[PDB]
Amino acid sequence: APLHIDTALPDAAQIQQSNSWLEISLGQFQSNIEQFKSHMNANTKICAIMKADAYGNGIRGLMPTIIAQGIPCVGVASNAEARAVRESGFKGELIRVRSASLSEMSSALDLNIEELIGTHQQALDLAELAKQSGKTLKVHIALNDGGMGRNGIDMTTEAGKKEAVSIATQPSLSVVGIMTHFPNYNADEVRAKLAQFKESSTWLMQQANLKREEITLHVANSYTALNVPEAQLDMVRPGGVLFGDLPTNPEYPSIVSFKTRVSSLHHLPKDSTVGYDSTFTTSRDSVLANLPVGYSDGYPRKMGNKAEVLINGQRAKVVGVTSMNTTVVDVTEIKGVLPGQEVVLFGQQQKQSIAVSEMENNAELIFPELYTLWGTSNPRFYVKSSGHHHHH
């Protein structure tokens, strides 16, 4: 992960001289949050999950919305993300959503992170950091009832139960949450595992003399929070749906668009090869648009000869394999194309749209594999537009 998340929001001139960039719809983000909120039970609260620099969309540009919306908790993965969240002025609960090294945890003490632990050694290490800093550190215990086999303690054996109790009774730590996480979007499996989580967490709280009313039980990602409402419990952990990436729930549109512009227009006669390995050959006299985007910007090699981009409201085929920095598009039958025109690589333009399913099939990746690396490799511009006195 990036060591530092750049502090400045790109301005319009900076975007103008960028090769490619992300346009983030702040109004769509606001709307997705409000829509999500409308489905949450009275007794739950929201922890907005902002790992991978807010799913590529950018923590620094999005935090003012999180604050305005009064969201009480934010989740992150890296220390740089935790810093960006605190630097926005956010004074709510900040949780880490993964296991983190002792070095990570120690360097983050001033950020007031609630770490996520699933092993005795993590508890011992944090207890020592607590002792050395003259305080009690707040932690969440990850349980393995969901079957992720990832950050949690499995309690299906005597040894696992014993280890869980040791975690939960560690001197110098305050257990503020107990959680699990589900591996798929199968509502019936989630319900079965939720029941087991209730049993395990109840048992653990009894053994460790924890007080139920002081513990936040949380298990739900975006899918679960909306589609298994009885799993909302004390707190939900939506990430993807806020950003409009919950495949089961298309009523939350994606907030991200990936754009570039036409740099130059080149005339190539019939029977001309394009790109490394000469995988495409023109069948007619052609006009090709040269775009200064390639796989080092996160537009994969596999897009070549498969994907279309949008130029002047029309679909144009990407021809030849993508280069490291450049993509070539066939604009022979698109009229009105000129250098400098905006190109949509993912998103909408006039009446055309590139679907997520379209991106995934062409890239042979899942959508978050694309957008998380878009976000480390391109500047973000936060577009704010609607009608009167309204966000979207």
Cα dist from 137 to 63, 188, 214, whole Å? 25, 36, 15
Q: What is the DSSP letter of 9?
A: P
Of these, 118, 146, 177, 240, which contacts ligand PLP (CB under 6 A)?
A: 240
Among 26, 49, 82, 105, indicate the residue that binds ligand PLP (CB under 6 A).
49
Tell me, residue by residue from 152 to 181, as one string, x for binding to ligand PLP by CB under 6 A and - for no binding: -----------------------------x
Interface size with ligand PLP, residues (CB under 6 A):
12
Distances (CA, A) of 378 to 120, 298, 323, 372: 40, 9, 17, 10
* Cα distance between residue 244 and residue 221, in whole Å: 13
> Has 276 been annotated as catalytic?
yes
151 lies in the site for Cl ion, by CB under 5 A: yes
Kindly state the smallest distance separating residue 218's Cβ from Cl ion, in Å.
11
Among 37, 131, 135, 150, binds Cl ion (CB under 5 A): 150
CA distance 363 to 305: 11
206 binds, among a second copy, ligand PLP, Cl ion, none (CB under 5 to 8 A by kind): none
The only residue of 97, 123, 126, 205 in contact with ligand PLP, by rule CB under 6 A: 97
Tell me the window of 78-86, 120-128, 239-247, 251-259 that interacts with ligand PLP (CB under 6 A): 239-247
**How far is CA 44 from each of CA 80, 185, 225, 228, 273, rounded to the nearest angstrom?**
28, 21, 10, 13, 59
C-alpha 305/C-alpha 23 separation (Å) is 25
Joined together, the tokens standing for residue 151 give 């950050």
**Minimum CB–partner distance for residue 149 and Cl ion (Å):** 8
- Whether 317 is a known active-site residue: answer no
d(CA 110, CA 237): 23
Two tokens, residue 211:
């007080």
Chain-centroid distance of CA 32 in Å reads 14
Q: Applying CB under 5 A, does 278 fall inside the site for Cl ion?
A: no
Residue 211 burial (CB count, 10 A):
8
Q: Looking at 37, 131, 135, 276, which residue is catalytic? A: 276
Rounded least distance, CB 97 to ligand PLP, Å? 4
From Cl ion, ligand PLP, a second copy, none, interface partner of 221 (C-beta below 5 to 8 A by class)? ligand PLP
Among residues 15, 67, 109, 148, the one that binds Cl ion under rule CB under 5 A: 148
Question: What distance in Å separates the CA atoms of residue 66 and residue 73, rounded to the nearest whole number?
Answer: 9
CB of 143 to Cl ion, least distance (A): 9
Query: Is the Cβ–Cβ distance between 86 and 113 less than 8 Å?
Result: no
Q: Cα(282)–Cα(210) distance, rounded to whole angstroms?
A: 71
Nearer residue to a second copy within complex by CB, 6 or 199: 6
Q: Which stretch binds ligand PLP (CB under 6 A): 82-90, 159-167, 217-225, 357-365?
A: 217-225
The residue ranges that bind ligand PLP (CB under 6 A) are 49, 51, 97, 181, 221-223, 237-241
The residues annotated as belonging to the active site are 51, 276
